[PDB]
């Protein structure tokens, strides 16, 4: 089984003599309001020997027991702070597909290397002390961490439309009508700058004999070359604690599980941040739907989320900041259709149309059959 | 016989059917293989869209015929 | 690639215009165009003029432009905000498509609404059940707003 192999790998990793914690306890006091600032002030000055000791975290003016829960809450807050796109370090791959990745604009800062080394230290500390973040990167990021080659198919996990266009170029012939050439126009704070994939590439149109090299260069530039220095600093910070000989026994999915734990979708947040059309919060269909979601496994909840909203990934702040094809659009439930028809979905509007059924069992059966063909997680 | 269907994603699928087989049978086989509902499948061959209630032989489909398949979903 | 293509499209539009739908940059910003669409004759929107705002992403032509209506239109595929739920801009987009093909597709959509993408379920249901009432409402809205 996959789970048994992952557990064996985890036990072997934590059994290594080079990843054993010390016995002395390192105190770490951070104010709840200024978590990011104090965390950056303390962590970015600790030594490698100090970071390998037991991590004891006490929030200021918050005295309590079960320090494990306190440390977990601290890691949750820090992960939601450092990886927040508003801090101009990471960014979503696309507005309607929330996948974190290193932001190319982050180079605007005078010294981004210190911040990215701090991020690497945070990730290494989370993995080292068996603590979980709550972010969800893209697969190419994990492949880069493990030093795996990146190809065209990897763009599928980043952006669907971009990958479809690249595949169209690969399959169909490219004529002279398209004004495609070896250059990329990137807009950084209004001004647009042209970057040449190859020397003197802005004056070399793509023929039918160059489109393969063009696709290779585009994939490399989009996935790797645009974030060289920042990712190098991040990986240096990460490997400052975890040796590269340890990370290279997992793959792009086991590493994700190790970093973020088992992925689950909260139901209380989902219920609190949804809206209804032609429905009321006290209607029988709504309460039956919420009960069914409450007593469901994470895989099927993810399948339903992908069926309704079009993707199984959520924003960094839950369902509150949920985006559609055009703009913000919270999860919507509407009464539409005949009783016999299956529930329908409108992905570009984050809308779910549920006919007014009569019994909860019928609703469960129809919803499961409707979401059968969707694959989640 | 054997026919080839190319989807909008560039995926090529080989279907083991017969010229006398109906369009409904081919659509049912496609649904079994990939889960695409027969109504949402649009098949184009020789500039003609395949319609339910007819057969492949009615569309002059022959050995190793190349068809274009488009599935409608999403929103 | 994101600027030469836009310049080529603008030049082509300036050479052989469709004589019905027009497009052009607003001020001096090639990544923000305004377009004008005439109401099709064989549709209830006849005699109306509609305005569209087109935003070209920096990944053009690999990513489709974002088109938004400005004049309110009573249609089973255009909501009150103005977003157009068109297949050619989300699923069947390819780099070979230009900005004139999008305008032609929208003008064709204004003739035959697609009931398989019911962006507005109420209007879609009215269209599928009572064609005459839907056409009357569309003509009333066109007379009120499009002119």
From Swiss-Prot, chain A:
Keyword Hydrolase in annotation: no
Membrane topology: Peripheral membrane protein
Catalysed reaction, written as an equation: S-ubiquitinyl-[E2 ubiquitin-conjugating enzyme]-L-cysteine + [acceptor protein]-L-lysine = [E2 ubiquitin-conjugating enzyme]-L-cysteine + N(6)-ubiquitinyl-[acceptor protein]-L-lysine
Pathway it works in: Protein modification; protein ubiquitination
Consequence when changing residue 347 to A: Reduces ubiquitin transfer between ubc4 and pub2
UniProt GO molecular function: ubiquitin protein ligase activity
Designated gene of the protein: pub2
Section covered of the full-length record: 295 to 668 of 671
Active site: residue positions: 348 (glycyl thioester intermediate)
UniProt-annotated location(s): Membrane; Cytoplasm
GO biological process, one term: cytoplasm to vacuole targeting by the NVT pathway
Entry's Gene Ontology cellular component terms: cell cortex of cell tip; cell division site; cytoplasm; cytosol; membrane; nucleus
Domain HECT, residue spans: 47-377
This protein's name: E3 ubiquitin-protein ligase pub2
Effect of mutating residue 349 to A: Abolishes ubiquitin transfer between ubc4 and pub2
Function: E3 ubiquitin-protein ligase which accepts ubiquitin from an E2 ubiquitin-conjugating enzyme in the form of a thioester and then directly transfers the ubiquitin to targeted substrates.
Subcellular location, principal: membrane
Alphabetic keyword roster: Cytoplasm, Membrane, Transferase, Ubl conjugation pathway
Enzyme class: transferase
Statement: the UniProt record of this protein carries the keyword Coiled coil: no
Extra remark beyond the main annotation: A cysteine residue is required for ubiquitin-thioester formation.
UniProtKB/Swiss-Prot annotation, chain B:
Residue ranges of domain Ubiquitin-like in the record: 1-75
Subcellular location: Cytoplasm; Nucleus
Cross-link (Glycyl lysine isopeptide (Lys-Gly) (interchain with G-Cter in ubiquitin)), chain numbering: 6, 11, 27, 29, 33, 48, 63
Purpose: Exists either covalently attached to another protein, or free (unanchored). When covalently bound, it is conjugated to target proteins via an isopeptide bond either as a monomer (monoubiquitin), a polymer linked via different Lys residues of the ubiquitin (polyubiquitin chains) or a linear polymer linked via the initiator Met of the ubiquitin (linear polyubiquitin chains).
Name this protein carries in UniProt: Ubiquitin
Curated annotation (Swiss-Prot), chain C:
EC assignment: 2.3.2.23
Top-rank taxon: Eukaryota
Outcome recorded upon mutating residue 119 to A: Reduces ubiquitin transfer between ubc4 and pub2. Reduces ubiquitin transfer between ptr3 and ubc4
SMART domains membership: UBCc
Consequence of substituting residue 108 to F: Reduces ubiquitin transfer between ubc4 and pub2. Enhances ubiquitin transfer between ptr3 and ubc4
A Gene Ontology biological process term: SCF-dependent proteasomal ubiquitin-dependent protein catabolic process
Annotated keywords: ATP-binding, Nucleotide-binding, Transferase, Ubl conjugation pathway
Pfam families assigned: UQ_con
UniProt effect for mutating residue 101 to A: Reduces ubiquitin transfer between ubc4 and pub2. Enhances ubiquitin transfer between ptr3 and ubc4
Active site: 85
Record's catalysed reaction(s): S-ubiquitinyl-[E1 ubiquitin-activating enzyme]-L-cysteine + [E2 ubiquitin-conjugating enzyme]-L-cysteine = [E1 ubiquitin-activating enzyme]-L-cysteine + S-ubiquitinyl-[E2 ubiquitin-conjugating enzyme]-L-cysteine
CDD domains per UniProt: UBCc_UBE2D
GO cellular component labels: cytoplasm; cytosol; nucleus
Effect of residue 83 to A: Reduces ubiquitin transfer between ubc4 and pub2. Reduces ubiquitin transfer between ptr3 and ubc4
Nucleotide-binding found in the keyword field: yes
Record note on what altering residue 91 to A does: Enhances ubiquitin transfer between ubc4 and pub2. Reduces ubiquitin transfer between ptr3 and ubc4
Subunit-structure text: Interacts with the E1 ubiquitin-activating enzyme ptr3 and E3 ubiquitin-protein ligase pub2.
Family statement: Belongs to the ubiquitin-conjugating enzyme family.
Purpose: E2 ubiquitin-conjugating enzyme that catalyzes the covalent attachment of ubiquitin to other proteins. Mediates the selective degradation of short-lived and abnormal proteins. Mediates ubiquitination of pex5.
Name of the protein this chain belongs to: Ubiquitin-conjugating enzyme E2 4
Source organism of this protein record: Schizosaccharomyces pombe (strain 972 / ATCC 24843)
Lineage: Eukaryota, Fungi, Dikarya, Ascomycota, Taphrinomycotina
């Amino acid at each position: 089984s996959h789970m048994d192999e992952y557990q064996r790998k985890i036990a072997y990793m934590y059994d290594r003599p080079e990843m054993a914690v010390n016995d002395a306890q390192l105190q770490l006091k951070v104010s709840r309001a200024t978590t990011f600032e104090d965390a950056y002030d303390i962590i970015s000055k600790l030594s490698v020997s100090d970071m390998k000791k037991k991590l004891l975290i006490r929030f200021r003016n918050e005295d309590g027991l079960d320090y494990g829960g306190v440390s977990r809450e601290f890691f949750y807050i820090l992960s939601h702070a450092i990886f927040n796109p508003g801090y101009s370090l990471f960014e979503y791959a696309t507005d309607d597909n929330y996948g974190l990745q290193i932001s190319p604009l982050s180079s605007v800062n005078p010294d981004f290397r210190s911040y990215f080394r701090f991020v690497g230290r945070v990730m290494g500390l989370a993995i080292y002390h068996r603590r979980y973040l709550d972010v969800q990167f893209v697969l190419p990021f994990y492949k880069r961490i493990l030093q795996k080659p990146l190809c065209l198919e990897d763009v599928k996990d980043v952006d669907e439309v971009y990958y479809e266009s690249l595949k169209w170029i690969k399959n169909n012939d490219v004529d002279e009508s398209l004004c495609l050439n070896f250059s990329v126009e990137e807009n950084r704070f209004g001004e647009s700058v042209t970057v040449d994939l190859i020397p003197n590439g802005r004056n070399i149109a793509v023929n039918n004999q160059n489109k393969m090299n063009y696709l290779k260069a585009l994939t490399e530039h989009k996935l790797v070359t645009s974030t060289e220095e920042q990712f190098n600093a991040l990986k240096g910070g990460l490997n400052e604690l975890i040796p590269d000989s340890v990370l290279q026994i997992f793959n792009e999915n086991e590493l994700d599980t190790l970093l973020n734990g088992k992925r689950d979708i909260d139901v209380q947040d989902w219920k609190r941040f949804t809206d209804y059309r032609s429905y009321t919060e006290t209607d029988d269909i709504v309460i039956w739907f919420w009960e069914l979601l409450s007593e469901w496994s994470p895989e099927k909840k993810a399948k339903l989320l992908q069926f309704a909203t079009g993707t199984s990934r959520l924003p960094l702040s839950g369902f509150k900041d949920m985006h559609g094809s055009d703009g913000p659009r919270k999860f919507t439930i509407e009464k539409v259709g005949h009783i016999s028809q299956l529930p329908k979905a409108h992905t570009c509007f984050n809308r779910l149309d549920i006919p007014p059924y009569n019994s909860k069992e019928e609703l469960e059966q129809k919803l499961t059959i409707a979401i059968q063909e969707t694959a989640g997680f | 016989m054997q026919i080839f269907v190319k989807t909008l994603t560039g995926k090529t699928i080989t279907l083991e059917v017969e010229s006398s087989d109906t369009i409904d049978n081919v659509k049912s086989k496609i649904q079994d293989k990939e889960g695409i509902p027969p109504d949402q499948q649009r098949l184009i061959f020789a500039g003609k869209q395949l319609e339910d209630g007819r057969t492949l032989s009615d569309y002059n489909i022959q050995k190793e015929s190349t068809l274009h398949l488009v599935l409608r979903l999403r929103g | 690639m994101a600027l030469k293509r836009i310049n080529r499209e603008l030049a082509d539009l300036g050479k052989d215009p469709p004589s019905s739908s027009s497009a052009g940059p607003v001020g001096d910003d090639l990544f923000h165009w305004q377009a004008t669409i005439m109401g099709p004759a064989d549709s209830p929107y006849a005699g109306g003029v509609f305005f569209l705002s087109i935003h070209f992403p920096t990944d053009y032509p690999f990513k489709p432009p974002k088109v938004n209506f400005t004049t309110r239109i009573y249609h089973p595929n255009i909501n009150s905000n103005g977003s157009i739920c068109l297949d050619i801009l989300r699923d069947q987009w390819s780099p070979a498509l230009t900005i004139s093909k999008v305008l032609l597709s929208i003008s064709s959509l204004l003739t035959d609404p697609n009931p398989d993408d019911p962006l507005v379920p109420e209007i879609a249901h009215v269209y599928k059940t009572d064609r005459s009432r839907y056409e009357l409402s569309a003509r009333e809205w066109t007379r009120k707003y499009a002119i």
